[PDB]
UniProtKB/TrEMBL annotation, chain A:
Family indicated by similarity: Belongs to the picornaviruses polyprotein family.
Function: Protein 3A: Localizes the viral replication complex to the surface of membranous vesicles. It inhibits host cell endoplasmic reticulum-to-Golgi apparatus transport and causes the disassembly of the Golgi complex, possibly through GBF1 interaction. This would result in depletion of MHC, trail receptors and IFN receptors at the host cell surface. Cysteine protease that cleaves viral polyprotein and specific host proteins. It is responsible for the autocatalytic cleavage between the P1 and P2 regions, which is the first cleavage occurring in the polyprotein. Also cleaves the host translation initiation factor EIF4G1, in order to shut down the capped cellular mRNA translation. Inhibits the host nucleus-cytoplasm protein and RNA trafficking by cleaving host members of the nuclear pores. Counteracts stress granule formation probably by antagonizing its assembly or promoting its dissassembly.
Compartments, record wording: Host cytoplasmic vesicle membrane; Host nucleus; Virion
Name of the featured protein: Genome polyprotein
Subunit structure as annotated in this protein's UniProt entry: Homohexamer; forms a hexameric ring structure with 6-fold symmetry characteristic of AAA+ ATPases. Interacts (via N-terminus) with host RTN3 (via reticulon domain); this interaction is important for viral replication. Interacts with capsid protein VP3; this interaction may be important for virion morphogenesis.
From TrEMBL, chain B:
Cell location: Host cytoplasmic vesicle membrane; Host nucleus; Virion
Stated role: Protein 3A: Localizes the viral replication complex to the surface of membranous vesicles. It inhibits host cell endoplasmic reticulum-to-Golgi apparatus transport and causes the disassembly of the Golgi complex, possibly through GBF1 interaction. This would result in depletion of MHC, trail receptors and IFN receptors at the host cell surface.
UniProt subunit comment: Homohexamer; forms a hexameric ring structure with 6-fold symmetry characteristic of AAA+ ATPases. Interacts (via N-terminus) with host RTN3 (via reticulon domain); this interaction is important for viral replication. Interacts with capsid protein VP3; this interaction may be important for virion morphogenesis.
Boundaries of the shown chain within the full protein: 324 to 561 of 2193
Name of the protein described by the UniProt record: Genome polyprotein
Family membership noted in the UniProt record: Belongs to the picornaviruses polyprotein family.
Superkingdom of the organism of origin: Viruses
UniProtKB/TrEMBL annotation, chains E, F:
Assembly description: Homohexamer; forms a hexameric ring structure with 6-fold symmetry characteristic of AAA+ ATPases. Interacts (via N-terminus) with host RTN3 (via reticulon domain); this interaction is important for viral replication. Interacts with capsid protein VP3; this interaction may be important for virion morphogenesis. Homodimer. Interacts with host GBF1. Interacts (via GOLD domain) with host ACBD3 (via GOLD domain); this interaction allows the formation of a viral protein 3A/ACBD3 heterotetramer with a 2:2 stoichiometry, which will stimulate the recruitment of host PI4KB in order to synthesize PI4P at the viral RNA replication sites.
Lineage: Viruses, Riboviria, Orthornavirae, Pisuviricota, Pisoniviricetes
Shown stretch of the complete protein: 638 to 862 of 2193
Protein task: Protein 3A: Localizes the viral replication complex to the surface of membranous vesicles. It inhibits host cell endoplasmic reticulum-to-Golgi apparatus transport and causes the disassembly of the Golgi complex, possibly through GBF1 interaction. This would result in depletion of MHC, trail receptors and IFN receptors at the host cell surface. Cysteine protease that cleaves viral polyprotein and specific host proteins. It is responsible for the autocatalytic cleavage between the P1 and P2 regions, which is the first cleavage occurring in the polyprotein. Also cleaves the host translation initiation factor EIF4G1, in order to shut down the capped cellular mRNA translation. Inhibits the host nucleus-cytoplasm protein and RNA trafficking by cleaving host members of the nuclear pores. Counteracts stress granule formation probably by antagonizing its assembly or promoting its dissassembly.
UniProt protein name: Genome polyprotein
Organism (species): Human enterovirus 71 (EV71)
Amino acid sequence: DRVAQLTIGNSTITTQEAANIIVGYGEWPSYCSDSDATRPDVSVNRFYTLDTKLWEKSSKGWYWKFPDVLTETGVFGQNAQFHYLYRSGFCIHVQCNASKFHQGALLVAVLPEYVIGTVAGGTGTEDSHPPYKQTQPGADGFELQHPYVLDAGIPISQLTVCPHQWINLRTNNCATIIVPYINALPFDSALNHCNFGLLVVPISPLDYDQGATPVIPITITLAPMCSEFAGLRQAV
Amino acid sequence: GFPTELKPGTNQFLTTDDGVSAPILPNFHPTPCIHIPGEVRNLLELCQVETILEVNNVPTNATSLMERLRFPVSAQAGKGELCAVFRADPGRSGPWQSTLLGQLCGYYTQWSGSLEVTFMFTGSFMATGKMLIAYTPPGGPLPKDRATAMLGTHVIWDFGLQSSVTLVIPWISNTTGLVSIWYQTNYVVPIGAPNTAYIIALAAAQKNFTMQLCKDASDILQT
Amino acid sequence: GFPTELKPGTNQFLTTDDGVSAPILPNFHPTPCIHIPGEVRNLLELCQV
Amino acid sequence: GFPTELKPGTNQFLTTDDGVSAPILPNFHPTPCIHIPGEVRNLLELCQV
Amino acid sequence: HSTAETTLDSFFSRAGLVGEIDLPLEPNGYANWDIDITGYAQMRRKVELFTYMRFDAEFTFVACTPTGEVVPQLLQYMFVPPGAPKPDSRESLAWQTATNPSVFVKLSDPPAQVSVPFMSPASAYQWFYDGYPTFGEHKQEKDLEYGACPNNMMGTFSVRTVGTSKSKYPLVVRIYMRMKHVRAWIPRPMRNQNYLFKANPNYAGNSIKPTGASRTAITTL
Amino acid sequence: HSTAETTLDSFFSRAGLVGEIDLPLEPNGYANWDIDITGYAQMRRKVELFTYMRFDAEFTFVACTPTGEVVPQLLQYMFVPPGAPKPDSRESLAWQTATNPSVFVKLSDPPAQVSVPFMSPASAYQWFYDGYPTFGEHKQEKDLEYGACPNNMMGTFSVRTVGTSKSKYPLVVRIYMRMKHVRAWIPRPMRNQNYLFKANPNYAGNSIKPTGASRTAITTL
């Protein structure tokens, strides 16, 4: 509803809060004060704005995996290789921009512990396991193949049990999710245990008549919250 | 020497007894209960969740399989004709089998409670038109036309004004009710709007929903 | 090590004992007692008819 | 005539239960606990060494 | 009003058949049962409804001949905790190690049952560990240490007949397991496609099938 | 004056013989016993005194050979609740599904008894359902589903021997049932004519008999 001017650290977004505003798990991200059985504020809390992936009429979906998405990109990415222990929350803010003459709802939803699986086949083989470049896709993300089962035998039909936000260009063109630290251990390696994996799945496909730019972008902007690290390693 | 006589039923093994039995390691202190978000203590907490209601049923073959979550809504053929109808009982197989609710009810037998059905329109911001959603109780069949459907409990649904309409299924317990969706109006498509748009249907249970009897369903598992 | 001595008459199955037995469905809450008119609790009330 | 039913798992011998069993010599008073320096009551007190 | 049936402890606390061990006459004279909450081939689906879970469990052992015939043999059931060695063979020191608890029962005796506490270093079990365990192994060819978190290993069960001289009776040991004090956490959507492997959620991409039944068109019944 | 003997719990709470089950050597090796408070071929009249009743009942299983011989077998008694599936065949998965509770006892061990709570969706059982079941429509041919209220199904009992290979010992399984916490309601006048069908109070019109005995005249003895 007109105007938008939001700035932190160095980054700067321009959104708004005129429709649905915020979805959390029911719990804001926080710290810990026990026996465990560094807290950067003046650099990490800046809006990392990812790369706008396109969206054709015949797309199938995309999914990033936290915290891999940033671990090799950004000041945050740096102090993750050098540190070994990790803990944080997240302020995911997905924003797509398109005309009123378009249509096609999206489902922004976060699925914690997104263990994936590929198809057995190819040559006549029975067993196979997904490569590193599908479990840890990085900033660019990864175009999934089989939406209906989330490449995991997991029906999308019930995905909304997990934190979710609808993006319907009729009503809303913006999404904001707040994700807390979710683990069986209060700290884990950020490198080899990618927690929740964000995924964006289109149900109502994008449509338009003749001649109307068939490609509307999806600007994904996210920012860490209550990040926490402990011991660190040596530099190159 | 406290005297006892063995009441029948001794030595029996019951797969359901809530007995406490000897511990392997009495001197073993487990990893302490830490706090983890999203703790669930009862399955009802899932039944209150908006889940997708597979109404469209066509696996031809798997590429179009994702078209099971959507409705077809176009200008053609036009006014008044029936858009879509579906059953009103989760236990039944099973356009409801998409929901977590349907699946969870598949692990039980007896139901009771109200249901919410939330529809979301996914067309342009410009396209308008109104549609009729009518609920039909168990007794009595699908009313043949809107005129007859209007008389029953129904909801006149517009696009242009609001995009999200929630239908409250009043009550269910043990034909088992019917819900019919009607083209009350034409499908208006300004100029560049697509003549055909799609609808997603969301379903969930009311806060008074209960199940009663445990039972296990059908899955497969090879070597 | 609670000392017990098995008094004779054990293992007997008597069709009249007022014993309580393990329940098949411990985690089951039956349909609650709703109110129904004309409850009879003793047969004499019929013999007075 | 105290009603008892043998919950399954009877007669089993488990290498770790802390059950109390009959004493060989009931009428016996062992040599009394005198004070000896350097008593250890937990192994952690050794790991701190 | 009654909502106890929809509680977790009412949803899992049922003794299921988990382990079937064959002890024939003429396999090697012992058996080791890696504890896996599957076996009861449906709890699998019932468990991956959640992601993080935690529970204590009671095991119960019903032993007989394939006949069902009852014979006066004296068995030894042994719990072998995680990390601890498994019995290499029939007379290895693993029966005597005494760290690994042991249960000595006859068959004339009623079924032996034992409770087992929650045995993970982590605060809870995981049915999904999207990533690789501490710590990361390189050197290629490898693509096997994935989605497997050994922190959820509950130990193993071993049985004898017992030694030293061989038994006379062919025996089968039916293994029953029931959960207690269950606490689950963040909820997963339930499986829709057939399983293929244990400890791995792969699926048959060649043959994808719809979640539920289907009709000819929407407007018909 | 003392009326405790004439109270309902004193009028019903006695274990009666309900089931006579044969398990021969060489019907198929199993049996399925639909729970019916009859069998004790007098309880109907004793029950048909009232219309609406509600009670929990404790069942007891006495097993032996036709000889009376006691044999070292291990039986499996299984409670199969309403709606739940029955065993397809002797080795169907209905034995392992574990939702349906199971009882493993020897015969050397004493009779197993287990209690079963009131299991109707209705507030009470009905012995009379004047009308057609939910939901009796029209279109003829069907007309057998009358006076039958499936809300009164208490579940079913199934037994094995157990598998895999059949036993050597011939078995018969006696099933005893006893009521608890009975509360009746609107009282019926007691039957006077002989029964003919189950779940239906028809009578023999060709052979109607007077309620009680009869005399030659009123003025005589």
